[PDB]
Structure 1
Amino acid sequence: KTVVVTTILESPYVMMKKNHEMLEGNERYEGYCVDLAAEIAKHCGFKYKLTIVGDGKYGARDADTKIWNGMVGELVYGKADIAIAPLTITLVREEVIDFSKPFMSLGISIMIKKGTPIESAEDLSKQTEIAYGTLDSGSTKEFFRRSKIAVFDKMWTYMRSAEPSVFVRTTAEGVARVRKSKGKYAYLLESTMNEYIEQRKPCDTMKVGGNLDSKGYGIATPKGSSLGNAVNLAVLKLNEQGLLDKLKNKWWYDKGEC
């Protein structure tokens, strides 16, 4: 049986090729996770089909219905066999799906226009002239919602009631908001994404300060999957071969335009 892989359009992980109109199947896409999926499929020896998650979300459980959405939802309800994307390994998700060891280590970071007078999370929490937010339905937002750290809790109290909303639907919208806000909007996002964008023209953004936390992305499978064990060993094998480091260079700096 062909393995149904659920993923999400997020540069440089999964993107449609410039000439995708004349292409079909998995060939329509390119990126870090597209290469990784190919690598995994080869070592575990299976055929697969890349599918973009219907609702474009990573995965969160509805507090009222208790229903999981996003890529996590597709695994939980059996719509997909494996998720290969920048999906954060978290406690709540670990309880409903399985994750391989991390294929990438990262942390929450700050993105500023450039020239913006901000160097740390503390700086953001001390003023109100510069607004800041995060993505929606993701591990980053949940981080600030649960944090007990003075600075982070103070930041959340602001973002929670901020008017208008400082939360964005996609990373692309976040970066776009930073760029057109005259340095009046800062964006909190995963370090890996921050670094990628900083190397993209108009080269007008920059990551500042150290990461606020440490986490990792993992390949996810439903609980009780015959692929979980194998995929986990594949990820470790790949990291040890240097393939994962080979791939990050290829999509982050080899294609850098700054």
Structure 2
Amino acid sequence: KTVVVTTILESPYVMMKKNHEMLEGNERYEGYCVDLAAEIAKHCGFKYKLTIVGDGKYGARDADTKIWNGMVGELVYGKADIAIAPLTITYVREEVIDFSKPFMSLGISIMIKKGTPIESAEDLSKQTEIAYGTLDSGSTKEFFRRSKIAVFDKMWTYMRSAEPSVFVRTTAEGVARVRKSKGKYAYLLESTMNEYIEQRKPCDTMKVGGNLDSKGYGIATPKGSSLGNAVNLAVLKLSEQGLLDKLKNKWWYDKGECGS
């Protein structure tokens, strides 16, 4: 009767606690999605086990093999019962798994090292001194691959062939590359993650320009799962009680690392 929850190590959604090496089970983890999982499970009346996605990916389909990886794959192949993570609701994913109504909003955004002479996606597209890229196997990369918008398509044509690769395996790696590249790398990532990082030491990154799109994260289940309806009602209840706002404010709490 224990529900297997797939999730991903992505700050501040799920993180290893201090001294996690002597902790066990769900108690190893903390973050927005850890708290959200506990609330959803309490409303729906299930016990659950948090498991970190084996390949560390969000989820994409191989164009050749047509196999899904990441958390999406874990749902598709029956390795998990639900995904509670910053997993973007997208058309291609909705074809193969189910999603609750969104629990958090986001859009694609630009992270620069402070002082970089870039204010917009158009700015990035019109120059070549500053490299830029995205996370592999997620919705941001797919956004650029599929876009017919001139600026974004121009960006895709550059990124897909850039050498060395501009794509990164994890968000943390993209952020580190921004920080270490003396302004010669900018990173395309979701506004949620960008805003979290902007408020943390060493306070050397910034979000610039407006978001490139508008969407949300949802709780995902395998297609047709019996859990979907109750999970969706739980998201709506927690939204209306103000609990999703409370969790956002807790995990994006500003302690004054950067200025004050």
Asked if these proteins are the same fold (TM beyond 0.5), I'd say yes
Give me the whole-angstrom Cα distance separating, in 1, the residues matched to 2:114 and 2:132. 14
Give me the whole-angstrom Cα distance separating, in 2, the residues matched to 1:256 and 1:228. 39
Contact kept, 8 Å, 2:110 with 2:209, in 1: the verdict is: yes
Give me the whole-angstrom Cα distance separating, in 2, the residues matched to 1:253 and 1:212. 25
| Residues 194-225 of structure 1, C-alpha deviations (whole Å, 9 max, x = no match) | 00000110000000010001111000000121
Give me the whole-angstrom Cα distance separating, in 2, the residues matched to 1:224 and 1:140. 26
| Residues 17-38 of structure 1, C-alpha deviations (whole Å, 9 max, x = no match) | 0110111000000000000000
> 1:67: how far off?
1.1
Q: Is 1:62–2:62 an aligned residue pair?
A: yes
Contact kept, 8 Å, 2:110 with 2:186, in 1: the verdict is: yes
Give me the whole-angstrom Cα distance separating, in 2, the residues matched to 1:130 and 1:64. 32
Closer/same/farther in 2, CA of residues 219 and 20 from structure 1, 3 Å limit:
same
> 1:256: how far off?
5.5
> 1:190: how far off?
0.3
Secondary structure in structure 1 of the residue aligned to 2:182:
coil
1:150 maps to what in 2?
150
Contact kept, 8 Å, 2:4 with 2:81, in 1: the verdict is: yes
Unaligned stretches of 5+ residues in structure 2: none
Secondary structure in structure 1 of the residue aligned to 2:194:
helix
Secondary structure in structure 2 of the residue aligned to 1:235:
helix
Give me the whole-angstrom Cα distance separating, in 1, the residues matched to 2:65 and 2:131. 32
Closer/same/farther in 2, CA of residues 15 and 195 from structure 1, 3 Å limit:
same
Percent identity over paired residues? 99
Contact kept, 8 Å, 2:199 with 2:254, in 1: the verdict is: no
Q: TM-score, normalised by structure 1?
A: 0.99
> 1:255: how far off?
4.7
Q: TM-score, normalised by structure 2?
A: 0.98
| Residues 34-84 of structure 1, C-alpha deviations (whole Å, 9 max, x = no match) | 000000000001100000000011111111221111111111111110000
Closer/same/farther in 2, CA of residues 231 and 255 from structure 1, 3 Å limit:
farther
| Residues 137-173 of structure 1, C-alpha deviations (whole Å, 9 max, x = no match) | 1100000111111111111111011011000000000
Give me the whole-angstrom Cα distance separating, in 2, the residues matched to 1:104 and 1:195. 13
> 1:235: how far off?
0.2
Q: How well do the aligned residues superpose, as a CA RMSD in angstroms?
A: 0.8
Q: How many residues align?
A: 258
Closer/same/farther in 2, CA of residues 226 and 34 from structure 1, 3 Å limit:
same
> 1:257: how far off?
2.2
Pick which of 59-68 and 121-130 moved more: 59-68
> 1:253: how far off?
2.3
Pick which of 150-159 and 30-39 moved more: 150-159
Q: Which runs of 4 or more aligned residues in structure 1 lie more than 3 Å from their structure 2 counterparts after TM superposition? A: none
Give me the whole-angstrom Cα distance separating, in 2, the residues matched to 1:248 and 1:202. 22
2:167 maps to what in 1?
167
Pick which of 41-50 and 60-69 moved more: 60-69
